[PDB]
Every structure is written in C-alpha cells, then in structure tokens.
Amino acid sequence: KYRVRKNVLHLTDTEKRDFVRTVLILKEKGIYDRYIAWHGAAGKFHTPPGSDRNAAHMSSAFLPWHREYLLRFERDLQSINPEVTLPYWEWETDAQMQDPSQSQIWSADFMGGNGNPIKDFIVDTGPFAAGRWTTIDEQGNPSGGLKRNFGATKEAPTLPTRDDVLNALKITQYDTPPWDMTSQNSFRNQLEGFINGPQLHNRVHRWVGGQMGVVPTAPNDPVFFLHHANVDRIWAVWQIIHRNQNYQPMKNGPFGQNFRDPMYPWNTTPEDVMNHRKLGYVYDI
C-alpha cells in the first residue's frame, strides 16, 4: 500500500526516463528475458493437458497470474532503482483521441512509435527500436527487433472504449464454469476479452501488433507491462466495486486454476495476490 503505480500521462519526464533506463538495465543483465520466458512457458502449460486453458490465459488464473508477473517485475525494477514503479497505460482514454498513435506513451522518449511499413513494421524510433533492443522468437532464439502495426487487423482496428471497461465492471461474477474462453457472465473472461472477441485485453494486444499480437512473443515489447498494469487496475477496481465477490473457482476447477492452487511456473497461488495493498502497491487514484 506504499508503492504508487501512476498513469503514464502523469509521469514527470524524469520518471519516464528512469523507467526506460531501469528496463534497459534489466535487459542488459539478462533478467528481462526471464520474464519473456515465464510468460511463454505458462502459455504452453495447459490445465489440464489437452485443454484450451493454460496457466496464464483462457482461464481463471489469467488475472492473478499477471498480477504476480507484474509484482515480480516491479520488484526487479525496485532493486535497480527504488524510485521506479510500474506505470499503467490507460488505453480507454487514448481510444478517445483522433489518432491514438499520437499518444505521448509512444513518444521517442518512452515506448517509441508505431512500426515503419517501409521496414516490414520494424520499430525504428524510441529506446526499444531495432538495433538498441534485441528480441527473441517463440523458439527462444534471437529475432530481428521489435515490430508494431497499430490497428492493422480487421478484428482490432481500434482500442477498447471506456464503455467496454464499464460494461465489464458490471459483471457480478468473477468467473464461471467451465472456466475457459467460453465462460459467460464472467468478469475475467470479459476483461481478458473473449466475449465477442477480440475485446479489451485481447483487443489491445491485437491492436498493437508485432510481437505484442501473439502470446509466445508478447513481452518482447516493454508496453506489455504498461498494458497489463492497466488490466490489473481494472481488476483492482472490480474488487472494490463488488467486494461481496471473491475469486472463482475455489475448488473443483482445474489444478493450477483454483483459489489455493500453485500458478505455474511459480508456487504462488491466486489467494496470495488477491489483496494488492498487501503486495505493497496502489494505483494513483
């Protein structure tokens, strides 16, 4: 309840600079890659085997898994710079802009811009531009650099709206059986974005494009964390609005999917991360 996570639009130029520096430091030491890999491994970890669900997506653990992911990542930033916390990208607000690509989050001072079509959409601007930031493929081998292609697909030509967020917050049930891509009247599946997909969470990944548009490579793009800090914020809000409500399933959904089950690749359980304040952080506002 001490660490404050801020809206990207509220950061001082120094905070932006420090965040970028710390990320680049984590990347140099080899710590950043551990994060890419954890998310990759989890994505291929089906619960149960053969099922469409995995440890981090298309199921109940989607939200708590990423919260732990972000928590661990933020603790790593703190180790380098104690004054650095994870900021959140409020995409619902950027969706209101005439041209979202002009949002300050994409400035050459922060995340860098959209991909360059003349270069097969390689990001050639910002601190994570090809040549300054190496990426790796799902195979785990060096790739050719970050790629982004804002709103190119037909299913995600735009960022989700404030209304989409509001409608999701309306759901009274955290999740509902079978606890997967098909769960109905489920806040979790709603936020994740499988209802009339792609929506919200899923839609943002698709809108961004490049490595961000697919599970095995998503974290190669630093914005992955700003996105999920926002997703984590929507959830924190949901938890306040419906305080009558608790995580689901409690038992008898799939192993690694239940309230007290370990979340591959960690021993962390959903219960362990239900209270973000106990985890040591809050969102401005």
Residue of 10, 75, 162, 170 interacting with Cl ion (CB under 5 A): 10
Residue of 83, 109, 155, 284 interacting with Zn ion (CB under 5 A): 284
Q: Which residues bind a second copy (CB under 8 A)?
A: 29-31, 33-34, 37-38, 40-41, 44-50, 134, 136, 139-142, 254-256, 262, 264-265
For residues 36 and 43, is the Cβ–Cβ distance under 8 A?
no
Distance CA 162, CA 96 (A): 9
Interaction of residue 236 with Cl ion, rule CB under 5 A: yes
Any idea what DSSP says for residue 136? B
Residue 42 or 168: which CB sits closer to Cl ion?
168
Helix (H, G, I), strand (E, B) or coil at 126: coil
Q: CB within 8 A of 66, min separation 6: which ones? A: 56, 228, 231, 232
Interaction of residue 240 with Cl ion, rule CB under 5 A: yes
Instruction: Consult the annotation and say whether 52 binds a ligand.
Output: yes
Distance CA 272, CA 68 (A): 9
Residue of 6, 67, 147, 201 interacting with Zn ion (CB under 5 A): 6
Instruction: Consult the annotation and say whether 228 binds a ligand.
Output: yes
Instruction: Consult the annotation and say whether 277 binds a ligand.
Output: yes
As measured in angstroms, the least distance from the Cβ of 226 to Cl ion is 15
Distance CA 263, CA 222 (A): 23
Instruction: Consult the annotation and say whether 227 binds a ligand.
Output: no
As measured in angstroms, the least distance from the Cβ of 156 to a second copy is 27
The b/e string for 51-84 (b: 16+ C-beta within 10 A; e otherwise) is eebbbbbbbbbbbbbbbbbbbebbebbbebeeeb
Residue 120 or 284: which CB sits closer to Cl ion?
284
- Interface characters, 157-196, with Zn ion (x: CB under 5 A): ---------------x------------------------
Q: What is the DSSP string of 212-263?
A: GGSTTTGGGSTHHHHHHHHHHHHHHHHHHH--S---S-SSSS-TTTSTTS--
Q: What is the DSSP string of 146-175?
A: -B--TT-SSS-SSPPPHHHHHHHHH---S-
Interaction of residue 7 with Zn ion, rule CB under 5 A: yes
Residue 215 or 274: which CB sits closer to Cu ion?
215
As measured in angstroms, the least distance from the Cβ of 56 to Cu ion is 6
Choose from Cu ion, Cl ion, Zn ion, none: what does 268 bind? Cβ within 5-8 Å by kind.
Zn ion
Distance CA 153, CA 88 (A): 24
Q: Which residues are annotated as a binding site?
A: 10, 13, 39, 46, 52, 57, 66, 68, 92, 109, 120, 163, 201, 205, 228, 242, 276-277, 284
Interface residue list for Zn ion (CB under 5 A) = 6-7, 10, 172, 236, 242, 245, 268, 284
Interface residue list for Cu ion (CB under 5 A) = 215
